[PDB]
Amino acid sequence: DIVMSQSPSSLAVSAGEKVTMSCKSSQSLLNSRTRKNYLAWYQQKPGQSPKLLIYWASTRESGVPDRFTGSGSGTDFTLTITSVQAEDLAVYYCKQSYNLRTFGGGTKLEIKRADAAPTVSIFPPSSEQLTSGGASVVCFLNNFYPKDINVKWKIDGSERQNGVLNSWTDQDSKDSTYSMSSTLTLTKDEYERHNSYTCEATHKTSTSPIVKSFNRNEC
Amino acid sequence: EVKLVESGGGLVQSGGSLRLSCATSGFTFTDYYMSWVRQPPGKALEWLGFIRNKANGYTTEYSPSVKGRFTISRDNSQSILYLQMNTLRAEDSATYYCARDHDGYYERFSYWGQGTLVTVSAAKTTPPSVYPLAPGSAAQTNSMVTLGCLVKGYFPEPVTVTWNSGSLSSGVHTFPAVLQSDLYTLSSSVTVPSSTWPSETVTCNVAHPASSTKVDKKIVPR
Ligand SMILES: C=CCO[C@]1(C(=O)O)C[C@@H](O[C@]2(C(=O)O)C[C@@H](O)[C@@H](O)[C@@H]([C@H](O)CO[C@]3(C(=O)O)C[C@@H](O)[C@@H](O)[C@@H]([C@H](O)CO)O3)O2)[C@@H](O)[C@@H]([C@H](O)CO)O1
Ligand SMILES: [Mg+2]
Ligand SMILES: [Mg+2]
Ligand SMILES: [Zn+2]
């Protein structure tokens, strides 16, 4: 049958540089009747539906920036993006339509940018939540790069790792940064036994962690 | 002005059936093959099948992965595409897209819907609790101030979060939901000039379609 494979699985490129992406088919997609390769490329930006970029291997769909170029023939195809822009962050899929249709597994394109320190904000549990017996403490670490970051929670000065869940956004399409949320969930009873709640972010951008805290007595 | 809009996604139990619809407009529906494509969260697109155009007798084809179990049909009077799914399993949990396909000449999927999310699970529908995230005790001399919304303990996905009914788009970060104990939690942050809040209102608008939940949570100071 027709197996589509893409390479690389993922890569990062700085704005303004060239991106090269590959698609292989297990059999030739060159239709002998029409003399065209039945191979299309789709761009799927984070949170969005796929969008057609290129079809018949090299035809750029109307409205698609000229920096996107499809090439290749038979079993091997290439999508090249020149002068990549922050907005080009996406998973790119190739798709054969020579015999029914089959998608490749995608190439994830991330955007390399200058290191950026997170902006850290901490939020105490709301009275609405506490009333029902729960206490979630939230820390936002916004607009940083690279994605790797450490968050530590301290309660009255002591590290706590139990009950902490983290979530990273996909890269931002405008500024190529990441953000992450860290949420520490406690019971109200346990929350009320301590005073100081601290989120500490350590990122390669500083040897000093960014520390945000609040004290329950100050609420 | 081509429009494709899927509906029908939601929670179904293993072994169950579910039919999706895709309402279309802005093109001559009968001229076009229509495909369904799905995407498990975080995974690749998978083509499922198509139904051919009128010139080709509206006949269907399917990927081996779903042939015999999924059925595609179309209403050519109303320009609606359907996907009937039977004997659903966890591996069928995915976003389902309808896509406009072949018109007898062009080889391309020109247009795709927004997708509808199907969750196959024995877990019960649970509406979110929505909590405001307002700054504690720390003046934002930071020129900018960051507020948030915690959307906790819901099932299944998805939820939608907007800020001031979509008026605030820039400076918004909505964090992917994390699953814990059969329940999802997510949060959303918004960052606005400190001169605009709390003098101006900032409200997160949360919807959880599975429970028809609609919440508008005003972020209040003090
Ligand atoms: C016995 C059938 C012979 O059909 C062809 C042939 O295969 O040589 C092709 C046929 O072409 C057209 C047509 O009706 O003019 C146009 C072409 O674009 C296609 O639409 C085909 C078929 O409908 C097949 O299309 C599909 C399919 O439905 O499975 C879908 C396409 O996206 C693509 O995958 C093709 C695939 O490339 C195979 O063709 O499959 O119809 C027509 O030229 C006749 C000719 O009249 C002689 O019979 O020959
Ligand atoms: Mg940001
Ligand atoms: Mg203590
Ligand atoms: Zn304690």
JSON list of C-alpha atoms in Angstrom, two decimals, chain A residues 36 38 42 44 48-50 52 55-56 61 93 95 97 100-101 103-105 121-124 126 128-129 132 136 138 140 142-143 165-169 172 179-181 185 218, chain B residues 33 37 39 43-45 47 50 61-62 97 101-102 105-110 112-114 131-137 146-148 150 152 173 175-176 178 180 187-189 217:
[
{"chain": "A", "resi": 36, "resn": "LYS", "atom": "CA", "xyz": [1.80, 14.95, -12.27]},
{"chain": "A", "resi": 38, "resn": "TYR", "atom": "CA", "xyz": [-0.19, 13.54, -6.56]},
{"chain": "A", "resi": 42, "resn": "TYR", "atom": "CA", "xyz": [-0.42, 21.03, 4.51]},
{"chain": "A", "resi": 44, "resn": "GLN", "atom": "CA", "xyz": [-1.08, 22.94, 10.72]},
{"chain": "A", "resi": 48, "resn": "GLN", "atom": "CA", "xyz": [-5.66, 25.21, 14.07]},
{"chain": "A", "resi": 49, "resn": "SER", "atom": "CA", "xyz": [-6.93, 22.99, 11.26]},
{"chain": "A", "resi": 50, "resn": "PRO", "atom": "CA", "xyz": [-4.53, 21.94, 8.51]},
{"chain": "A", "resi": 52, "resn": "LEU", "atom": "CA", "xyz": [-3.31, 23.58, 2.06]},
{"chain": "A", "resi": 55, "resn": "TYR", "atom": "CA", "xyz": [-0.34, 20.48, -4.35]},
{"chain": "A", "resi": 56, "resn": "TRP", "atom": "CA", "xyz": [0.74, 18.43, -7.35]},
{"chain": "A", "resi": 61, "resn": "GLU", "atom": "CA", "xyz": [-1.95, 27.50, -3.64]},
{"chain": "A", "resi": 93, "resn": "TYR", "atom": "CA", "xyz": [2.21, 17.18, 6.57]},
{"chain": "A", "resi": 95, "resn": "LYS", "atom": "CA", "xyz": [-0.24, 13.67, 1.64]},
{"chain": "A", "resi": 97, "resn": "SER", "atom": "CA", "xyz": [-3.70, 11.18, -3.40]},
{"chain": "A", "resi": 100, "resn": "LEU", "atom": "CA", "xyz": [-7.03, 7.02, -2.00]},
{"chain": "A", "resi": 101, "resn": "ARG", "atom": "CA", "xyz": [-5.13, 9.29, 0.40]},
{"chain": "A", "resi": 103, "resn": "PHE", "atom": "CA", "xyz": [-0.70, 11.44, 5.21]},
{"chain": "A", "resi": 104, "resn": "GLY", "atom": "CA", "xyz": [2.88, 11.43, 6.35]},
{"chain": "A", "resi": 105, "resn": "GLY", "atom": "CA", "xyz": [3.58, 11.64, 10.05]},
{"chain": "A", "resi": 121, "resn": "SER", "atom": "CA", "xyz": [3.12, 35.63, 38.49]},
{"chain": "A", "resi": 122, "resn": "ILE", "atom": "CA", "xyz": [1.65, 33.81, 41.47]},
{"chain": "A", "resi": 123, "resn": "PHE", "atom": "CA", "xyz": [-2.04, 33.52, 42.40]},
{"chain": "A", "resi": 124, "resn": "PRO", "atom": "CA", "xyz": [-3.59, 32.41, 45.66]},
{"chain": "A", "resi": 126, "resn": "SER", "atom": "CA", "xyz": [-9.88, 31.96, 45.24]},
{"chain": "A", "resi": 128, "resn": "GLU", "atom": "CA", "xyz": [-14.85, 30.43, 45.69]},
{"chain": "A", "resi": 129, "resn": "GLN", "atom": "CA", "xyz": [-12.55, 27.42, 45.54]},
{"chain": "A", "resi": 132, "resn": "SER", "atom": "CA", "xyz": [-15.60, 23.89, 48.49]},
{"chain": "A", "resi": 136, "resn": "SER", "atom": "CA", "xyz": [-5.07, 25.55, 44.05]},
{"chain": "A", "resi": 138, "resn": "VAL", "atom": "CA", "xyz": [-1.18, 28.92, 40.39]},
{"chain": "A", "resi": 140, "resn": "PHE", "atom": "CA", "xyz": [2.34, 31.53, 35.39]},
{"chain": "A", "resi": 142, "resn": "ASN", "atom": "CA", "xyz": [5.22, 33.66, 30.63]},
{"chain": "A", "resi": 143, "resn": "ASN", "atom": "CA", "xyz": [7.17, 34.50, 27.49]},
{"chain": "A", "resi": 165, "resn": "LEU", "atom": "CA", "xyz": [1.05, 19.80, 37.69]},
{"chain": "A", "resi": 166, "resn": "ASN", "atom": "CA", "xyz": [2.73, 21.70, 34.86]},
{"chain": "A", "resi": 167, "resn": "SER", "atom": "CA", "xyz": [1.58, 22.65, 31.38]},
{"chain": "A", "resi": 168, "resn": "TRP", "atom": "CA", "xyz": [3.51, 24.36, 28.59]},
{"chain": "A", "resi": 169, "resn": "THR", "atom": "CA", "xyz": [1.89, 26.27, 25.77]},
{"chain": "A", "resi": 172, "resn": "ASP", "atom": "CA", "xyz": [3.93, 31.68, 20.36]},
{"chain": "A", "resi": 179, "resn": "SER", "atom": "CA", "xyz": [4.81, 30.00, 28.58]},
{"chain": "A", "resi": 180, "resn": "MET", "atom": "CA", "xyz": [4.00, 27.50, 31.27]},
{"chain": "A", "resi": 181, "resn": "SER", "atom": "CA", "xyz": [1.60, 27.14, 34.14]},
{"chain": "A", "resi": 185, "resn": "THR", "atom": "CA", "xyz": [-3.27, 21.73, 44.56]},
{"chain": "A", "resi": 218, "resn": "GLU", "atom": "CA", "xyz": [-1.75, 39.19, 53.75]},
{"chain": "B", "resi": 33, "resn": "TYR", "atom": "CA", "xyz": [-15.50, 14.50, -3.26]},
{"chain": "B", "resi": 37, "resn": "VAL", "atom": "CA", "xyz": [-9.59, 12.97, 8.40]},
{"chain": "B", "resi": 39, "resn": "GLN", "atom": "CA", "xyz": [-6.18, 13.39, 14.50]},
{"chain": "B", "resi": 43, "resn": "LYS", "atom": "CA", "xyz": [-0.56, 12.75, 16.76]},
{"chain": "B", "resi": 44, "resn": "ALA", "atom": "CA", "xyz": [-0.59, 12.75, 12.96]},
{"chain": "B", "resi": 45, "resn": "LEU", "atom": "CA", "xyz": [-3.48, 13.25, 10.56]},
{"chain": "B", "resi": 47, "resn": "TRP", "atom": "CA", "xyz": [-7.29, 9.92, 6.29]},
{"chain": "B", "resi": 50, "resn": "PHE", "atom": "CA", "xyz": [-14.21, 9.82, 1.07]},
{"chain": "B", "resi": 61, "resn": "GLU", "atom": "CA", "xyz": [-14.04, 4.46, -0.09]},
{"chain": "B", "resi": 62, "resn": "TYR", "atom": "CA", "xyz": [-12.41, 3.90, 3.27]},
{"chain": "B", "resi": 97, "resn": "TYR", "atom": "CA", "xyz": [-12.14, 17.02, 10.28]},
{"chain": "B", "resi": 101, "resn": "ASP", "atom": "CA", "xyz": [-11.48, 16.86, -1.73]},
{"chain": "B", "resi": 102, "resn": "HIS", "atom": "CA", "xyz": [-11.30, 16.13, -5.49]},
{"chain": "B", "resi": 105, "resn": "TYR", "atom": "CA", "xyz": [-9.48, 17.45, -11.70]},
{"chain": "B", "resi": 106, "resn": "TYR", "atom": "CA", "xyz": [-7.53, 19.07, -8.85]},
{"chain": "B", "resi": 107, "resn": "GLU", "atom": "CA", "xyz": [-5.60, 16.89, -6.44]},
{"chain": "B", "resi": 108, "resn": "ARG", "atom": "CA", "xyz": [-5.83, 18.80, -3.17]},
{"chain": "B", "resi": 109, "resn": "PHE", "atom": "CA", "xyz": [-7.92, 19.19, -0.05]},
{"chain": "B", "resi": 110, "resn": "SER", "atom": "CA", "xyz": [-8.77, 22.87, -0.50]},
{"chain": "B", "resi": 112, "resn": "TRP", "atom": "CA", "xyz": [-10.94, 21.91, 6.15]},
{"chain": "B", "resi": 113, "resn": "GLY", "atom": "CA", "xyz": [-13.44, 22.41, 8.94]},
{"chain": "B", "resi": 114, "resn": "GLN", "atom": "CA", "xyz": [-12.50, 23.48, 12.46]},
{"chain": "B", "resi": 131, "resn": "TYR", "atom": "CA", "xyz": [-11.96, 30.21, 39.45]},
{"chain": "B", "resi": 132, "resn": "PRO", "atom": "CA", "xyz": [-10.62, 33.72, 39.05]},
{"chain": "B", "resi": 133, "resn": "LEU", "atom": "CA", "xyz": [-6.90, 34.31, 39.29]},
{"chain": "B", "resi": 134, "resn": "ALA", "atom": "CA", "xyz": [-6.34, 37.80, 40.67]},
{"chain": "B", "resi": 135, "resn": "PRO", "atom": "CA", "xyz": [-3.03, 39.19, 41.99]},
{"chain": "B", "resi": 136, "resn": "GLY", "atom": "CA", "xyz": [-2.42, 38.63, 45.70]},
{"chain": "B", "resi": 137, "resn": "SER", "atom": "CA", "xyz": [-0.40, 41.16, 47.66]},
{"chain": "B", "resi": 146, "resn": "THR", "atom": "CA", "xyz": [-1.37, 39.41, 34.58]},
{"chain": "B", "resi": 147, "resn": "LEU", "atom": "CA", "xyz": [-4.74, 37.91, 35.45]},
{"chain": "B", "resi": 148, "resn": "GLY", "atom": "CA", "xyz": [-6.07, 34.42, 34.99]},
{"chain": "B", "resi": 150, "resn": "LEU", "atom": "CA", "xyz": [-8.48, 28.33, 36.41]},
{"chain": "B", "resi": 152, "resn": "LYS", "atom": "CA", "xyz": [-10.66, 22.80, 36.96]},
{"chain": "B", "resi": 173, "resn": "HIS", "atom": "CA", "xyz": [-2.05, 32.27, 26.98]},
{"chain": "B", "resi": 175, "resn": "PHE", "atom": "CA", "xyz": [-2.46, 26.34, 28.75]},
{"chain": "B", "resi": 176, "resn": "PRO", "atom": "CA", "xyz": [-3.18, 22.84, 27.47]},
{"chain": "B", "resi": 178, "resn": "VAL", "atom": "CA", "xyz": [-3.73, 18.14, 31.94]},
{"chain": "B", "resi": 180, "resn": "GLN", "atom": "CA", "xyz": [-5.59, 13.84, 36.46]},
{"chain": "B", "resi": 187, "resn": "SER", "atom": "CA", "xyz": [-5.71, 27.70, 33.06]},
{"chain": "B", "resi": 188, "resn": "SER", "atom": "CA", "xyz": [-5.60, 30.83, 30.98]},
{"chain": "B", "resi": 189, "resn": "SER", "atom": "CA", "xyz": [-3.57, 33.96, 31.61]},
{"chain": "B", "resi": 217, "resn": "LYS", "atom": "CA", "xyz": [-16.00, 35.09, 35.55]}
]
